[model samples]
Each structure stands twice: as structure tokens, then as C-alpha cells.
Target: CSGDVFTALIGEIASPNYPKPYPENSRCEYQIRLEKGFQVVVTLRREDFDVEAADSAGNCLDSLVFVAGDRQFGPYCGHGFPGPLNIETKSNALDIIFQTDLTGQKKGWKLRYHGDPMPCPKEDTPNSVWEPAKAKYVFRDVVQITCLDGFEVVEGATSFYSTCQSNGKWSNSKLKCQPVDCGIPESIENGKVEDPESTLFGSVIRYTCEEPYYYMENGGGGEYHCAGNGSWVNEVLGPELPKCVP
Candidate 1:
């Protein structure tokens, strides 16, 4: 091996030690520096167990040796430091192991410097860019504005603060509103308004009844909400609500 060619050594595997963010343990390039005017020999492999080392000063260190690649029954390809080369009076690429360690139950490898290395800020300010920014309101009193199951957030603030002074109720109408969405309501009573709150603009509110007893299909007791160009077309259910049949 000579100091002319740089080699990508085998990658490191994840440590099978602790839990998440475990101690990563793997091989690293064994680096040993030398004085100028002398050549350094390095070795690596691709097909056969023959070593490849070269240099720029025309001095080729040719003691070819194939370091063990399948040391742990799971051999992987080289990652960063690549092959045998020359060390002709200057710094050059040398064959070195890219050391790493796997420290969890999972079996895999993660390269160093691939993740962020910055510290998170403690105080809230305009420059803070944390995920789901600090909530402006306390999460305790925000009961009515809470989200429901099966539905996702369409629009609205996640957190809004409310103060309860001398009165039993909270200050102001501090009621947060979340658009209610039921993906195709089923088993709706024909005449009764089971979920009158859900009937909003651009929605089709149907009705249904128990089985073994058939009711009239459009017996005239159903209601729906229709939207206008600007505001909510109406506030309540349709005036001409439908009725159930016997």
C-alpha cells in the first residue's frame, strides 16, 4: 500500500447494546502519521485478497495484504476512507478503518455528522423555530375547543389562554371553535335531529331508523346545511325538516 490513492474503508454497524440513541460502536480508520521523504503503504479489497498501495514519489510499497472484511459474519462495503495510496512529502488518503458502534437492539448503521449538532433554545422569542411553537394559551381551560376523534384539524389555534377571575365561568367568550366533520354520517334517525350541531354549510345530513321496522324513505323530516357565497347560509337546520314514517 502506498500514499497516492485514498480508500473508502468498510462502514460501521449499529451497536446491539442499549435502547434508542444507543452507543454506536464500529471500526474506525487506524491512522498513523509519518515524517516527510518516506512513503506509506495501505491495503484494501474489491474482488480478490490482493493489497493495493501506491505513492506519487514513484516509490510503490507492494506488500499486498487483504484485511478481513467478513469479521462479524456480516460484511459491508467501504464508506468514507477509500484505498491504498502514497505519502510523498504531503498528506494523502491512507487505508484506515471507519470505526463505529451499534448500541441498541436494532441492527443497522448510522454515520456520524449525519444529524444536527445544535442545542435547543430555552426561552421563547421570534427567532425560536421549534416544532409546534410554544402555545400562547394554557391547555387546561381549552375543553370546548378540543379536537374530536376520526377527524383532523381544518383550521383554528392549537392553544389559546383563558383567565377565570371572580366569576365561575372563564373571562370573555373565550370559546375556541373547531369545525366538526363526520365522514358520512350513518344510522341517522329519519325525523329526529340527533346531531343538530353537525349540520353546517355544504353538508348533507341524512336520517335513519332501527331495522325490523321500516320507515318512509323521504317521509319529510331530514335536514342539511347549504353554504352561500360569503357567510354560513343559515344558522339552524333547514326550516322544512323531514319526518319519520311508520
Candidate 2:
């Protein structure tokens, strides 16, 4: 009424001269600005709207709307309570306006505004930093990483990108960005190894046994992997290496 600013964590507002029927011709605007990194929520606790109803088509009259950036919620009127309105805006600002027509006026409505903290938590990687500085992230906020040298992304990790979830937690909190190392491919007694100079994660090495000699009991030469855990993929397959013996 007097001023349009509200800063409390939780507060309530109603039409001018609430409880009693509002004036026929009236206009009021209220702005709720929460703290930085937080947004505002307005819930319709109670309402007794008495404005023009939907005609042949579904359109409303005599406005009561909530504006958050480019989004608008209603021109609600002519009805019982229209259920609670939950607003978690992208920015820390919420605007509500109530305008009445020249004739009818009802008990108006009551709304509750709350300040919701951003869902994103502050996190630090072993050898990297999150993008955007990771202050307070909102829902679905993407998290990207930049790793230091000598440490590449570990293989089998979840993903490089993650997001803040609606449940107030990170979607991927596993932190797959750890130290990276894929050691040399183990040598085969009768086979030759084609290796790369750098044994970093995702490195691949080819293995080939002499003509008659082959890898595996199935008698065909196969490849070995430079695993992410600083070991060759040969150990899991068994102790015997590919042989070229007749």
C-alpha cells in the first residue's frame, strides 16, 4: 500500500482493506525482492474472487497476476480459491498486481510469500574448479569443470556436466573429475604391442601375435585396453598371455 518493497523471509499480503469487500474501482501492486541467490514464492492462501467469468471461450477478467521476468501466471477472478501458487523465479524478484473492475468487489484474496534459497551447493574438485564460481546455483543449473595438467578425466566417470536438482541436491555429486593415469600395456610373450607415448586415460593399444600364434583360447588376436586405474586390461582375462608356439 504505502511502499512496494518486502524483505522478510516470509510474509503475507492481501487486497486493500482486506477481509471486507475490496473497493469497486481499485489498483494495487506489491513487489517481493528476496536476498541475492534466492527467489520468492507466492501461495494463494485464500481467495473470494467476484469478477467477470469466462464467456463462450475460456478467458478471465478483473486481474490478479504474478509477474516474474517474462513469465505471467494469471488474471484470476470469478471463483472460489484457485489452489496455491508456487513461484520460484529465475531472478530474485516477484511482482504481484490486483486490479478491480468498476462494479463488483468480493473479499479479495490473501497471498503468502516466502524466500527460497538456491538449491545448488558449493563444491570443489580434487584438482579443478567449477565454472561460474559455484556460488549459489538454482534448479537445473549446469556445472562444468576445468581440470589441471597431468590429470585428465577418469574413464567410466558419470559425466563432465551436472546440474542442480529440484530436491535441493546435485544431480551428479559423484565427482568423476579425478586424477588420470593409464599405464603401459603389458607385454605379451609372443605378441607385439602397438603403444602410444602418452598413457593417459582413454588411450588405446593394439596387440598382435605372430601368424600361427593368436590371442584367447578361440585362436584370434585381440586388443588390450589401457585401463583408467593405471593397469592393463590383461589381468582380468587371466595370467597366460597370447602365445606364438606351435
Candidate 3:
């Protein structure tokens, strides 16, 4: 009987009538699909194949082949246990085809296949976390990073977004996250600091314009809240507590 479609960490496959001559003019196809971030590896355990040799045109006749998506491995025949077949596919799918001719036949074949996790690109930075964290990643897969609170994505950092390359590596490994430092709110001119002694991030303070220049109407800029980023929430002109027209 023909084998059914399989998807797993490891499995085995063989010709329709293993250990016996496969029926003449017969064909068998097997498909293996692995989860994301993995490639299929077929280790030929046993083989007794005999197919038409390469014609003058170097074309294979009747034989076994490996197909990963649109890629073709080998229309291989006349083999004495050819080594393992490693299929590095951009997709998570793999296909195997076996064909027999009307003339020659052998003990068919038996093979084992397994999925090897594709190595993932290294984490770019410690200040950020990648989404869908996994041990492996596949080509064209995107791993996005998000900086934690109290930190901001560094300008032009690869940490913001990383793309898995064909080589199973990230497009960028230099991306990083840095502490958010908005810097001390520029000291207001003609104003005196009140309430707080430091101007660090999350430091709220009060400000009062120097006398003579009485506080302006409405929002006299009596208070300024230091934002988590260290910048003043209410950025007064020149940090100048809305001073009355001099």
C-alpha cells in the first residue's frame, strides 16, 4: 500500500512493496510537511534501484527524486544506497517521487525522514523582546521587537524589525533598545524651580515666574509634570513660566 501524507518530527518511508520488487510501470509519491522553522532531511536506509542512465543529454530516466516546493533534487537511480538527502526549503513542504520501469526492478527501498529545526537568528538586543519567540526561524519570517516601558527603540535599530534571511539568519543583528532619556527640561528663564530638586525622568516640579514679570493669565504655567521620557509635559516657552509681558 502507498504511504499517507506525514508531518512530524521524525518518520519513515518506503516503496509500495518494500523488500520486494516494486510492480513494473508503477509510481509512488510521498509528501512531508513540517511546521514553521524546519527543513526535512531524508536518510536513505536501504536502496536497490536501477534506472536508465543519463542519456547523452544528461537526463535521468526512471528513478527517485526529491522535491521541495518548486525545487528538484535528483532523478536518481542505479544506486547502491545513495547517502542522505538534505532538503533546505524556504517553505515547510517536501515531496518525494519514485518511479519504476517495465524492464528492471530491485528490492525497492526504505528511508527515514526527519525535521531539523532551522537555527534562528540571535536576539539583537537585551532591552527588547521578539514576538513569537522560538528556538528556530525560517526564511522571510519576520521577528518584530518591542522595547519595554522606560526604554525606547534606538533610532535606526534593527531591533525594531528583523527579517529572517534565506540563510536562516536575521537581516540585522545590530538593532538595540536604549533607555529613554528625554533630558532635563530646559530651565525656564526668569523663573524659579519649585517642588522638586531633580529634573530626572518622571520628576514633576512646580515653577513660578520671577516677580515683576507677573504670571500670565489663564495657564500661568504654575506646574510642569516631568514625563516618563524626562521631558516636561507642559513645555513652557523657553521653560519660561508664561511671564507677563515685560
Candidate 4:
């Protein structure tokens, strides 16, 4: 029954030819000293604050810090840091940075409690004990992917779920996964667009010259296909996909 917390954050600036600095984005931590385990909810505004984790050498400890959204909040996505992460039990310093990968051009976001680090669940198991095994609540958060001008999301969702294991390591193989896309469909003749409209996402377009220009064998045609991950593949070389001419 303690509404106590210790709040802190870090900031930074990145310049091309200068040393980059790191500071807390704006999340303060709290220390709980109760007789028993307590359920807590730790959150931050990703739009206003960003958190990150780095090593003593200033190298990024984790490429991705937060990737999922709390479904309890609304139609959203989320991600979890791999761990038997315990703020009260473990003494490791954590970095929960905020980011705006595709904000203005995409959508807004929020946070939710998940995994071993979340507050104790309110079930028969209860929220009063430190049970790492049954503590991890499986919340499959989805991430969003921004594709190139003509491509779209295919293989994985921008977001996914991360589960904790008995070995104290949460599944973290898909963090910082970038979205794939299909290349542009442009008819190129000698590196020039022959017909911009005849191009398709994954269509075999052929290119050729009438009389004066010799039709380069390697520059004539290629094939393209719509990939499973919401993008296009099987791109034809020389003329590429979506290019149209004869």
C-alpha cells in the first residue's frame, strides 16, 4: 500500500563530428520496502521521453529498449526486455528509453505492464509474492513497420511478444528488427525512366530500344514478386520491377 517512487531520467545530443552524450530521458525509479510483494505499474510517455541502455564504453547495450504497447490501454502494440528482471531483487541499472521511429508519419503510442518486471498479477497466485515462473504474463504486443514508398509490411509485425524463461532470460531475438519493402517500379533505359506508369509492385517488366540504341542483353528485363512480409521481392536486375517499356 505504498504510492512511493524515485523518479529520474537522462538526456542526450548527437552531432555528426562531435562526441555524443547520454542522459536519462525522463523516468524516475522507485524503491519498495513493504512486508510482502506489491503490484506496481511503471510507465512513461514515449512521445515526450525516450530511454536507452548503454555499456561503460558508451556502446548500446540493447539496440531496442521498448517495442510493444499495452493492450489494456487500447488498440496498441508493445515489447518486453528479456529477463528475470526484478527491480527489487536485482541490482542491475536498467535503461527504458523512449523513441519516435514513425510518430508524426505514423500513430501515437502508450505503455502497459507485462513480463516478470510487471506488478504481481491479481489471481489465485496473487500479487503478493515474487513468483518469476508464473509472473510473466504473456501479452503479445505488435510493432508497426514503415515501408519504402511502394513497399509494405510482410514477414513480421512491427511488434511481437517476448516471454521469460526458467533460466532468467526473456526471448529477445527480434528486437530492433527493421521492416522490409519492395523496390520502386521504374522503367530505366540507360539509367533513365522509360515509362513510370507501367511499373507494378511485383510484375515482370521488359525494356527495349527500337533501332539506334543497342538493346543491352542484361538491360532488357527482369521479374518481381510480392513478398510475404508485405513487401516485394524477386526483383529483376538492370530494369528492376514495375518498369515498363518496349
Candidate 5:
């Protein structure tokens, strides 16, 4: 005689006119289903449970029965609180069923419930750190990761996505951040490279001539980038580094 359905992120429930004598021989059912990547909890509020523990029928007269994730829990009847119980999902759903027998003076119960987003995996991965580290991750939530400056996103990607499953785990990523290799630059007849820095992706190097009066053929052979695609590139000056001549 007292039941309803809920899809809210937070809410409350009470047996018919709870805390007062409830109708006899009544049956009620409550169903809860939440959006993706979320689980729910229901609390039989403190001091709010008074379902009949026994009737002329003996052991159980009024009780609460909960079934979730295809598993079942108590036909609970008692004067004190039972739980702030977890409702694991089955296809994102669960059911709460309440029943009572005809003869009893117990008032009934009241409950409070809320949905919680599933937690995601740690932020730090071997190759990258998923950013924004801001807050909770609900079902189906997505985030992207980027490789560090010297490394590549393996041979396949520069960045990739991660997601939270309805089962409360994150999907795997393809990232195995790897360092790129750009082989040693060849020496010029009368020229040399500037005091070099790193030799990995994103590294920069400049070129110059030796003291002997050698000169650059053009301003072109001036720079190189340890660039993408496993090779070095002039990147800005042109397609190639110009030759050195004297």
C-alpha cells in the first residue's frame, strides 16, 4: 500500500505513514535504477525501524527484503536500524520489497538513499598522467592522457582516451609512452653543431661554421628539430638544412 519508484541521485523513503501504526496485511515495493557508472545505498534510518518481529504466524510478520545484482538480503524486522546498505547493480538496477502481516502494533520504517559515482583508477600511469584530477568519475565518463615532451605515444598515437565502465572499472588505454630516436647528425666539411642539448623529441639544435673562414651556403642549414616520424627536421627554415661551404 506504500511504495514508489526512484531514479534520483538522492532521495528518501518511508513505509506508509511511517512512525505511526501502519495498515495491516500490507505489501509495498520500491524500485531504484540510476544513471550509468553509479551505485546506490539505502539506510534504514536510526531509530526509524519498528516492523513486527512476530505475529500469530510466529517468526516473521513484517519485514524488508532487498534483491540486487541478482542476490538477496534479509527479510529484516526489528526495532533498531538494520543498515546503510549497498545496492550493487544488475544492468544498473535493484529492487526493495516490503511486506507485513495482519496483526501487529509496530509502526514501520523509513529510509534514506543516495547514488554515488563509481571511482576511477589512479591518475598516474607509467607513460602519462590523466589530468584535471578534479573529482568523481561516474559511469561512462571519459578522460584523455598525453605523452611527456621527450616521449611518443608509442608508434600509434600521441594521445588517447580512457573511460569508466558501468562495472566501476576503467577501460584500458593504448598508451605505452616511448622515447623517440633521431640518430646523430652528420658532420660538415668545415662546420659543427652548436653546443647541443637533448637528442630526443622536441629537442632543438643550431649549426655554425669552423673558424677557418667556412660559411653557411644560406641561412638554411641553421637549425634542426628532433622532430616527429622518427627523424630530424628543419621544421621552420625549410624542407632541408642547407650545405656549408667555404
Candidate 6:
């Protein structure tokens, strides 16, 4: 049979006489049409997709394919099912073709489809946080990604952005969050900072008076650490560097 159209929120489609071998020289076309703006996604029912395989001479005998937006997917003909695979149409219309050559046929195929206006899956990267924290995403959804503590979004970057595609995919964004770098703290007056070279994020620096006559001010530990905000801070006595006095 041809020109079969399915217009429902959820539906199943299979060979004319599913679970049994299909008749030879028969062709079937099933069109999945949902409301406008809602994309359609289809997947095999699993353990039921069996069609004419390649001939002994290595020629395909039967074909099953998807047509959407004038783009042909494939001529699926083989034994076991492919996978937990999901194919989404470019638009709201999907046309699946099951055709066999005059030679013969097999058990054929079965699949289910549904329409989703928001079909995109959320995407994530390491050392970053996403706004609008959600378990699921949708087409045209804008996602924002920024670095977390101890890390900074790659140089010359503030935050990364991505948009969900109608194809049920999120566009790729090469977002890099490098560890914060505080460089060497400004040289203190009449004092030396031990291990000034170790100015990486969260690194500690100890300031000591150059002369024995002088001592650290306020009896502070003179200890400073590279903070998460990319700066040195002496938590013991506030963010300012502990002063050295005579």
C-alpha cells in the first residue's frame, strides 16, 4: 500500500503484515506528519528489523529509507537492528519508504515515532557551569557557559554560548577554562616574597623582612595566597598584603 499518512502525537508503523515475511514485489510508504513547528523523531522497535540482505553477489536486495526535506537517509537492509538510534527529521514532515525487489523479502521492519517541539538534549563541558540548569533542552534554546572557581574562561573570553539545532543537536563550542594565574605579587618594600615564581592560582607566598631589625606588622603570619579572583590575599589580616615594619 502507498500514500499512508499518520497524524498523531505518537504512532507505530510496520510492514503491512508485521512479524511475518512480507510479500514479494510490494512497496509501502508511510508519511509521518505532525503539527507545524514540531519536529518528528523515529527509532526502530528493536529485534524486529529484518529485511532482504545483500545478495550472494553483494548487491542490495531490498531497501528501507527516510526522506525529509528532500534528503534521502539510507537504504537500510540487513539483519539485526542498528542501535538505540534516533533519527530526527529536518522539518515536521517525515516520509519512510519500504520497498523490495521482485525476488523476495524478509520479516521487514517496525518503528515508532513522536513529535517534540523541544527535542534537543543538553550539552556540557568540564570546569564550567551552565545557566538555566535543566535536565532537558529544546530547539533554538540559548545556553550560557562560564568558568568555575579556580578556572577562567580561555584568554580573551568572557563566556561561551550555544544554540540548540533543529536536528536535535547542540552546536559545538571549543570552550576552555584555564586555571587562574596571578603572576608574581608586586615586590614588597624592604621585604622579599619566598617562591615568587609560584604565583599560580591558590599558590601561597610568605613575606619576610629583609633585616632582622624589622618584623611583620600586626603580628600577622605574612602569608598570602593567590585567590580565586586572580589576586593575592592575606585572609589572616584582610586582602591587603601584610605590611613589614621596623
* TM-score of every candidate relative to the true structure: 0.21, 0.52, 0.55, 0.24, 0.61, 0.48
Provide C-alpha RMSD values for all models, in order. Answer: 20.3, 10.5, 8.1, 23.4, 7.4, 8.0
Which ranges of candidate 4 are over 4 A from the true structure? 1-180, 185-201, 218-246
Overall lDDT per candidate, in order of appearance? 0.31, 0.64, 0.64, 0.32, 0.68, 0.74
As for TM-score, the candidate ahead, 2 or 5, is 5
Candidate 3 ranges with C-alpha deviation above 4 Å: 46-52, 81-91, 123-151, 154-212, 215-229, 232-246
**Clash pairs, model 3 backbone:** 158-175, 159-175, 188-239
Clashes within 3 Å, all models in order: 49, 0, 3, 33, 1, 0
Q: Evaluate model 1: give its TM-score.
A: 0.21
- Model 1, 158-208: lDDT tens per residue? 333344222224443334333444333334353333555444335655445
Off by over 4 Å in 1: 1-181, 188-201, 206-221, 225-234, 237-246
- State the lDDT of candidate 2 residue by residue for 1-246, as single tens digits: 444698887898877677666666666778777766566766665443444455566665567778887887776766665645565555567877877665544667777777776677766567776777745777668877766654555545323677776556776576556556655566767677777776765565667766675444424435555554455555445323455454
* lDDT tens per residue, model 6, 1-246: 676578897888787777767767777788888876577778786577887787787566787888877776776777876545687665688888877776454777888888877567755567888777787778778888777778876555446787777666667555578788776677778788777666678687878886886777746678778877677877667567766778
Estimate candidate 1's alpha-carbon lDDT, on a 0 to 1 scale: 0.31
Per-residue alpha-carbon lDDT of model 5 for 1-246, expressed as tens digits?
A: 645678878888777776677677767778878876666666565578787675565566677787777667676777776555444433346677788776657777777777766766564467666755556765667877777666677555567787878676777643568787675765666778765666777777777887567777674557877876556677555536657666
Error of 4 at 9 (Å): 26
Per-residue accuracy of model 3 over 131-238 as CA lDDT, tens digit each: 878876666678788877766654532237777764566865655666665555555567666646555455666666667765545254556765554356666543
TM-score: model 6 vs. ground truth:
0.48
RMSD of 5: 7.4
- Scored by lDDT, the top model is 6
* Runs off by more than 4 Å, candidate 5: 2-4, 54-61, 71-75, 84-92, 134-142, 163-165, 171-175, 178-228, 232-246
